[PDB]
Amino acid sequence: TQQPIVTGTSVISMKYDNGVIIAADNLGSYGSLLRFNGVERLIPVGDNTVVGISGDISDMQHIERLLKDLVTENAYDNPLADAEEALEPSYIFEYLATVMYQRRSKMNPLWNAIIVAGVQSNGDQFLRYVNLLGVTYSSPTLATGFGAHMANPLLRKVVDRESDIPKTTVQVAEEAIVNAMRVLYYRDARSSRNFSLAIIDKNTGLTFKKNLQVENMKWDFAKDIKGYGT
Amino acid sequence: MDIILGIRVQDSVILASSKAVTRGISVLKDSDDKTRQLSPHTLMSFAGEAGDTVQFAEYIQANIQLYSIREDYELSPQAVSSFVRQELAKSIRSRRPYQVNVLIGGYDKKKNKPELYQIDYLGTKVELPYGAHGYSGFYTFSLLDHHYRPDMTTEEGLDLLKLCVQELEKRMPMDFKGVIVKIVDKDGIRQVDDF
Amino acid sequence: MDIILGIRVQDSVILASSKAVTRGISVLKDSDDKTRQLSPHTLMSFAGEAGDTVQFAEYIQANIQLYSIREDYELSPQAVSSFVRQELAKSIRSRRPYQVNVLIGGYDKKKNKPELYQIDYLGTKVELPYGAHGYSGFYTFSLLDHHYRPDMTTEEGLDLLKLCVQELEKRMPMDFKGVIVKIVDKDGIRQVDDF
Amino acid sequence: TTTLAFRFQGGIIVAVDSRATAGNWVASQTVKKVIEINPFLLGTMAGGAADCQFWETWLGSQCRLHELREKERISVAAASKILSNLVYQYKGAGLSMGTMICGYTRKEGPTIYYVDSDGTRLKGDIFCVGSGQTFAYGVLDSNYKWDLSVEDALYLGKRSILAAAHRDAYSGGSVNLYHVTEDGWIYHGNHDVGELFWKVKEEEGSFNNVIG
Amino acid sequence: TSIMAVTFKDGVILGADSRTTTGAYIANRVTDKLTRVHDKIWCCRSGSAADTQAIADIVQYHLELYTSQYGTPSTETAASVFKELCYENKDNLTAGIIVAGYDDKNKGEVYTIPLGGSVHKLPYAIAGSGSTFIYGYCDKNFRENMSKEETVDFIKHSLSQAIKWDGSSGGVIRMVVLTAAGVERLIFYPDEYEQL
Amino acid sequence: TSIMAVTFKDGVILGADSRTTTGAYIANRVTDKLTRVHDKIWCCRSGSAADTQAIADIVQYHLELYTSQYGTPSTETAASVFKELCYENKDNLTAGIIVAGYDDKNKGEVYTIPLGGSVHKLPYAIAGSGSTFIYGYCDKNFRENMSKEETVDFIKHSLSQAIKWDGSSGGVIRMVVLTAAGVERLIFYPDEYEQL
Amino acid sequence: TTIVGVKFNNGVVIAADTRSTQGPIVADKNCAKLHRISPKIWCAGAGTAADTEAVTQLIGSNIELHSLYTSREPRVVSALQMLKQHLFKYQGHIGAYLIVAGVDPTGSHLFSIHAHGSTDVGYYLSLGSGSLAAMAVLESHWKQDLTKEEAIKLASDAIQAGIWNDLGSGSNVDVCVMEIGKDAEYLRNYLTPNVREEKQKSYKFPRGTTAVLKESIVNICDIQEE
Amino acid sequence: SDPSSINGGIVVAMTGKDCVAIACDLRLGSQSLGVSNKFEKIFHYGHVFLGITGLATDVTTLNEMFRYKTNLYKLKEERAIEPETFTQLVSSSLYERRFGPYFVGPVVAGINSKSGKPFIAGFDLIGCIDEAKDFIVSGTASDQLFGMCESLYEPNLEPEDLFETISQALLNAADRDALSGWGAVVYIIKKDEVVKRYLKMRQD
Amino acid sequence: QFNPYGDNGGTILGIAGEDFAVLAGDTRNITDYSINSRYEPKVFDCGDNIVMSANGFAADGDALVKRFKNSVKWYHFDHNDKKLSINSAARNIQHLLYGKRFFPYYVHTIIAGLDEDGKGAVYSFDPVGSYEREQCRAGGAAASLIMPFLDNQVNFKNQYEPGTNGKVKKPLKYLSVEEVIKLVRDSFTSATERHIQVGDGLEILIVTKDGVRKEFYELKRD
Amino acid sequence: MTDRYSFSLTTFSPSGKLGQIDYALTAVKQGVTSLGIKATNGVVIATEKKSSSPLAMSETLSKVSLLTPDIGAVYSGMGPDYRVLVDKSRKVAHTSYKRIYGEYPPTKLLVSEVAKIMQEATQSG
Ligand SMILES: *C(=O)CCCCCCCCCCCCC
C-alpha cells in the first residue's frame, strides 16, 4: 500500500473506421502544485501500439521500462521479431493486465489507470482499459479519471455503439478527441493546455503528434459576469 | 434486572419476575420484588437499568393513583398501557431515556377479560397471550407456543409457568434465584407465596 | 470455564471444579469434568478460554505419560508443576498464548506429603495450602483464611469445601451447576460421586 | 441456522432446518445442513456455510483414509477430534463453524460430539446449535426421555425445529430428519415448514396465538 | 485562489483570478472574487466561498447603515468591521480577506485579514493558495508609488506565475482600479497573461 | 530546507542553505547539504537527514565500485542509482534529492528525484520547503546558457528570497560549481544575501 | 439528478431529468425536479430530495407574501438572497443544491446555490451527479446570443448526456422556459426517450389464486342516523 | 442498531381501475426474535388509508398523531380529509422533525371522494413525497417488493384481479426477507366499499 | 488506505430446464455512477458443455473464470481427455474459491450445463466457496429484485388452483426453453427499470446436448 | 420600559356592555360605505375610494385587497387597522394552513383565523 505523489490526469481514446486515437496532456502534478510541464504519458510499443498511462508517474516510468524490456526480450532468438512474431497490442495489454492484478493481489499496486490503443495483425482495432485493481474493460470510447466523466459523453455522441465505428472517419474522431481535451482544460483543475495525441491506423500506421495545444477557447463572456448575485 | 414473564389465561393474568438483584460480581438480594400495583386490578412488572426501573415504576404508579383519586374510577388496563407506552415513547427521545422494559397484567372489570401488554423502553406496545423481556423469551416462547391453550385455568397456567422456570433454571447461565409469581383477576392482585 | 478450587489438608489434596459449560446465552452441558490425571498421584484442574483449556491439559498429560514410560518412574508433583509452569511461561510470549489457569494437586510418595500448586496462564507458580482461579478466590479465601487448619482430616477438608461452594452458590451471579470433587492421596486419585 | 441431535433408547435423532441467510436476505430455503460422511457418520452444519461444507467433506476423506489404513470403521471420538484438532490450528483466523458429529460404533454405541471453531469438543446426550438453538431446547428439554419410540423421537426432533423455524427469523424453509441406528443412519424426508406448520397446528392443537 | 492588492501613486488596485474548485473539479471558471462593500472600498475573498460571501454581505450592510448616519466610512473602518466578524467567529469561519479602499485624505490603503482574524495594514498584500509561489517574485519586484500601468503589470505578472503553479488558481485575471477618477474594472484572458 | 541546481554554459552549479531544524529549534545552523557521490557528480539532500545521508553513502559506494570496473559514470547513471533506492524503498524513505553532475561529453546536467522516486531531467531544479516561495521568481529569471557570475547571482537571489520566507531555511548559502576547470566551493553569509 | 440552466437572447431556460433514486434503487421513474418559487421564477433541485422541495416551498411562500406586501412582482435576487441566507444558517445540513432562474422587472437571471450558502452567476450552469456529463455538452455547444429554440435544444441535450452516461440520472427531460414579457411555459416530460418495451408475458393471475383466511367490510362512513 | 430494521415489516400499495389496494405483513420482532403476528401497519382516517413500516414505536406514535390531526381537521373543515391533502400533512409532519426524524416509511392510499380518482403516495423518513401512478413499496423487503411489483403489475386491473397481483407481490417478497411475514392483510378500496382480506402464508 | 476490492455492478441469472440450462447476464460494466462498457461479456463458455459467470468485482471474476478454464484444460491432460461433469466442475470451483478463504474473490459465481443423466443443472456459489445445486438462481446487484419473481413464476410459490381456495397448490409443470427465455427477458427488463447498475444489453447462453448457443437482446441504456 | 399594560383595556360595564367594542362599532359606523353581494356563479365586493385630497393618487390606496388567489376583502372604518389585518390575514393563510396542507384555506376557515386575531385584541393585555 502507498499513496500516489507525482500524478498524471485523464487519458482519453476512441475507435474509428480504420484504427484508434489516444491522447493525454503533458502535466505531472504534485498535489495542487502543477510541478512538471514536459511529461510524455503516451508511450509507443513498436509501430502498432500506444500505451496511455494516468496516475502515479514513478509507477508509469517503471511500466515504461517493463515495455522497453518486453520489446528487447521478444527480439531474442526471434527471426520474425519485425514481422509475424512482432508484439501485438493484445499481447502487451494482457501482460500489463497480469502485472496490475498480481501487484494489487500482493497489496502493493502500480497506482495507474492504463489504456492500450493499437491495431492487430488482421487490421482489427484494439482498445482496452486496465487499472491498479486489475479491472479490465473494452468500449468504442475509453477514458481515465476526469476523462471518464466529461470526455466519454462527448466521444459517445460520435460512436454510441459498435455499428457507429465504420461510419466514423479519422478527421471526425480526431476533432472529437481535440474538443474533449479542450473541455477537460476548462473543467479539470489538474490538466494542462499542452498535450500529445497518437493515431494508430491500419493503412498509414502510427502517427505520434507532440506539443499540441488547446485552442479556439471561449473566455470573452467572462467580462459580462459581475458579482456573485447582486 | 433479568427475567420477567407474563401469561394471560381464561380468567386471569400471571406475572413471574426473578428475585435476584446482582450488582457487579456479587448477588446483593435474593428476595427482590420487581413489580408495582398501579391500581387494584392492574399490576406492572419491570426490568432494565439499575435505578431507572424502580424510579419509572413508582412514577407511573403515582400518576395512575392520582387519576384514580381525581375521577374516583379505575382506568382500563388498555388505558394504563397506552399512558405507560406514551411516557416511554416520550422518554426514548429525552436527554437521558428510561432504560426500562415492562409487562402490564390487568383484569378489565368492564369487559370481564384478563389483558397482558408487553412494552419495551422504546415505547413498543403489543397485547399478547404470553410475553417476556430480555433473553427469557428465547427459552420460554417455544414451550408457550407449544403448550399454550386460551381456555387454560389459572392452576393449569401456574403449572405451565413452572415448566418455563425449570427450562430457564436448566439452560440460562445466570442464577436468578427463582421468581415471585402474582395473579391478576376479577378479585384483584394476590401473590403465590410457594413457587 | 468458571470456578476451580484446591485445598491441601494433612494427608491429601482436594480439587473442586464446576460442571457447567456455557457458550453464549446457553448452558450446553452440566456434567463437564475440568481435570486430567497427569500421573497416578498427580491431578491437574484447569479453567480459561474454550478449546485452549482441554488442548493444553491433554498436551501436558501426554508429555508426563511419555516421561513415566521412558523412565519407568512417576515425577514428583513439584517436578510436574515446574514442567507445566515452563510451558505456560514459554506460551505467554508465543504468537497465540495458551489462555489457561491450572491447579496441580499431587501426593509426593517420596516425602509422603500432599502438595497443591496454583499456576496462571502467565506461568506464575505458587505452592499453597488452598488456592483458586478467577473470581472464586474473592468469595472463598476469607472462609479458608478463617477455618483452615493444616492438620485437618480429609472428611473435615470436604466440609470446609462445602461451605466454600455454598457461599459461591449464594453470592456468585453465574449458575456453575455444582462441582466435581476429586481427592489425591497416597492411594492415588478418586472422585467423590455425591456432593 | 437451527440444528439439533439427541440420544435415546431407539438410537440418535438428528433434525436440521434448511434456511441460509446473508444479512436479512434469505439466500436459500433448499440448503442441506446434514453431511453423510459414511453409513454410520453424520455431521450437522451451523455458522459459516463455506467453512462447514469444505471441512466436513474433508473430514469424510480423513475417515475413509483411516478405515483404509486400519481396516476398521473410525470411532465417533476419533472422527470428531480430527475436525476439532484441525479447526484449533486455524483458531483466531476467523473460521465460523459450530457442528455436531453423530455416529454409532460397537465400542461407543450412539455418540454425539459438539465440535466448535473456538476448539470446544464436548460429548453429550442433547445438543442444539445455531441462532434458533434456544427455541429448540425449550421443546426438547420438556418432552425428552431415554424411552422414546423411533417414531416419537423423530416427531420431537421435527417439532423442535418447527418451534425455532416459527420464532427465529434466521431459521426456517424445511426440516431434514435423520435417524442413526446400530445399522447406520436412515433419511426421514424433507418437510416444508409452510405445510408442516398448518398440519401440526391443526393436529396438535398448538400455536393458538397464530390464526389459521 | 490567487488574490492581491497593491497601493500606487494614484490609489490602489485589486487583483484576483476567476477559478472556484470543488476537489479537482472547476465548479466555476469565471468567478468574481473582487466584491464591493462601498463605492471606493472593495475586498478580495479567499477560503470558503459561502463564509466569505456571507461576511461581505454583512459588511456592505454595516457600511451602508454607517453612510446613512455618519457619511462615507474610511478603509480602516471597513477593515475593522471585517476583522470584528472574522475574529469573533474564528471557530466557524474559513475566510482570508484583503480589504482595499481609496479615501481622498488617506489615498490608497490595503488591509489583509488572514484566518486568525488579525489585521495587517501593508503597502501591498497577497493571499489565497496561489500566493505561496509568488512571495519571492512580489517581494523582489514591488516598489512604492508605482504608476497605474506599472501596478497593472506587477499584478498581471505576479498572478500569471501564481496561476501557472497553483492547480486551484486559473481562468481570467480580474482587476479593480480605485482612484480619485472613479472605479475601473479590468480583465485579462489566458492568451494574454500565459505568454508573459 | 532550500536547495537548487542550475545548468549554465561552462557546466552546472549546486545551491543550498545551511539550516537543519528539529521542530522550531535549529539543531545545526551550518549544515552541508551539498554532498559528493563522485568527483564531478554531487547531489542536494532534502527531507529526513538520516534517510538522505544513508542513501547518498550507498550511491557513493555504488559509483566508486562502478568506476573501479567501467571507469567514470555519467550523471544519468548516478541519477538512476538514486532513483532505484528512492523508488524501491518509497514506503520507508522521506528524501527529495537533486542530482547535478558535469561530463565533458554531456556537460552540465540536472536530475530532480521527488518523494515518489520519479526522475525528471531539467535545465534547473528547486526542492525543499523553501522552494515553494521562489517558483514564481526562478521561472521569471532563469535563462539557458547563463555565465558563471549570472548563475551564482541567480542562485544567491533565489535562495535569499526562499531563506527570507521559509522558517525551516536559513544560515549560510553554500554553493558547489561543477565545470571542466574542476570543483569550486562558494559560501555567502547572511550580511551579504539579506541586503539583496 | 442532472439539472442544467441556459441563458438565451430574451430569457433563461432550465431543464432537469425525471429519475429519483434511493441508494441504487429507482423509487420514482417520473419525478418532477422543477419547482416554482413564483410564476416567473423557477428552480430545479439536486441533493437531499426532502430539503430541495422543503426549502423551495418556504422561500416561495415568503416571496408571495413579500410580493403582496410590496405590490411588486418578485425578483430572482430576492429568492436567491433568501435561499442562500437560510442554507448558510444551517451550515450545509439542509442538503439543497439548486439552479435558480427567472424573469422579473429587472430582466432575465440565472444563478446556482450550494447547501453551504455559496452562489454562482453564469450564462450556462449544471448541477447534480451527471453535472459533469451535462457541463461537457454545454462547454462544447454553448455560444453567446442563443435563440429560444437553440437554448431548449442545448439544455435538453445536456440533460440527455446525464440521462445516458450517469447512473444517478435517467428517464425523461423536464423543461421550463422563462422569456421576458411572456408567461413561463412549464414543459413537463418535454422528451420521453425511455419508455419500457412491451413485456413478453402477461402476469395477470386467475381469480382465487391467492389463499384467503378472512373477509370483512371496512366502515369508512361516519356514525349513521336512526 | 439500524432503527429501520429492528422490528422489520413491509407495506405495498397499487392502483387499479377505479380502485386502490394497500397491503402489509403482520410481523413485529426484536431483530431475530419474532414477538407479535398481529401487528397491523395499515390504519385509516375516514376513507384515507396510511401504511407505516420501520421502527414500531414511531409507527404507533404517528398513527396516534395523524388520528389526532385528521380528527381536528374534520371538526374545523366539516368534511373528511382527502388523500392528496393528507399526503401534504404527512410530509409537513415528518419534515418538522428534520433533525430528529421518525424512522418510518409511510404509504398513503385512497380514492378522492369528489373526483373519484385513485391515489397512492410513498415518503422517506424526513417526508420527501413519492407520488407514483403504478405502485409504492416500503419496509425491509422493499428491494424484493420493487422486483415483484415491476414484473407482476399492469395498469387498469379490476379490483378482484388487483387483489391477486398485490397479494402475490407481498407474499413472495416477504418469503425472501427474514424480518417480514408471519401473516399478511390486503385492503381492496373502491369509492364506497372497502374489503379487508387476511392472507394464509408460511409462518417462518 | 488501498482498498483492493471494487464493485463492477451487473446481474446474472441461471435457470435449469428439464433437458436444457440457461445462464443469462447483462452486458453493462460500471464503477460508482459511471458506465465503463455497455457490452462487456460476463457469461463464458468454459468447454465440456459448461457455462460460467463470476459476478461482482470483475477483476476477481475474470481471475476465477480464467483459473477454472485452466482447470478444465489440465483435467483433460491428466485424465485422458475425460469430460468434466457439471458436479465435478462445481466441486473443483469450491476449492478454487476456498483456496482464497482469507482473501476472497468478491464474486457471486453461477455455473450451468447438463448433469450425467442429461437433465438441466445450475450450481450457485458464495464468495468463499459454499455451493448448492439449484433449479433457479439470480446473482449480483438486482438478485433481490429477480429471485422473488422466479420463486413465484418458476416454482409457482404462493400460487394455488382456483375454486379450492388455498387447499390445492398449482402443479409444478416443466417449462420449455422458449418459456424460460420469456421469464429471463422480463426479469432483466424489470431489473433494468428499478436498478441503475442493470441495462444496456442482455446476453443469454443456452446449454443443450447439441452444445452451447447464444442469444443477445437490447436493454434500456439510461 | 417593557409593556407594563398586561391587563385588559376592554372590560364588562355594570350593564354587561363591552365599551371598547361598542365604540369600535361606532368608528365603523362613521366609516365609508362598503357592500358585498353573492351571485350563483360569483361574489362582488365594492366600496367608494374616498380620496382625502385630489393631489393624492387614490390608485396607490387599495381598500379592496387579495388575501388568497380565491379570497378578497373590503372594509369600513379605520384604514390603518384594515391594512395590518390584511398583512396578518395573508400570513396566517400560509403559516396556519398552506405550509401544512399544501393548498389555500377555504373562505370560512381564513375568516375564522382573522376573527380570532380581532377577538384577541378585545381580550389581550
Ligand atoms: C433518503 O432516502 C433519506 C436521506 C435523508 C438523510 C437524513 C437522515 C437522517 C438520519 C439521522 C441520523 C441519526 C441516526 C441514529
Ligand SMILES: *C(=O)CCCCCCCCCCCCC
Ligand atoms: C456468506 O455469508 C458469505 C460471506 C462472504 C464474505 C465475503 C467477504 C468479501 C470482503 C472481505 C474483505 C477482506 C479484506 C482482506
Ligand SMILES: [Cl-]
Ligand atoms: Cl544533514
Ligand SMILES: [Mg+2]
Ligand atoms: Mg497465580
Ligand SMILES: [Mg+2]
Ligand atoms: Mg529564515
Ligand SMILES: [Mg+2]
Ligand atoms: Mg423464522
Ligand SMILES: [Mg+2]
Ligand atoms: Mg444513465
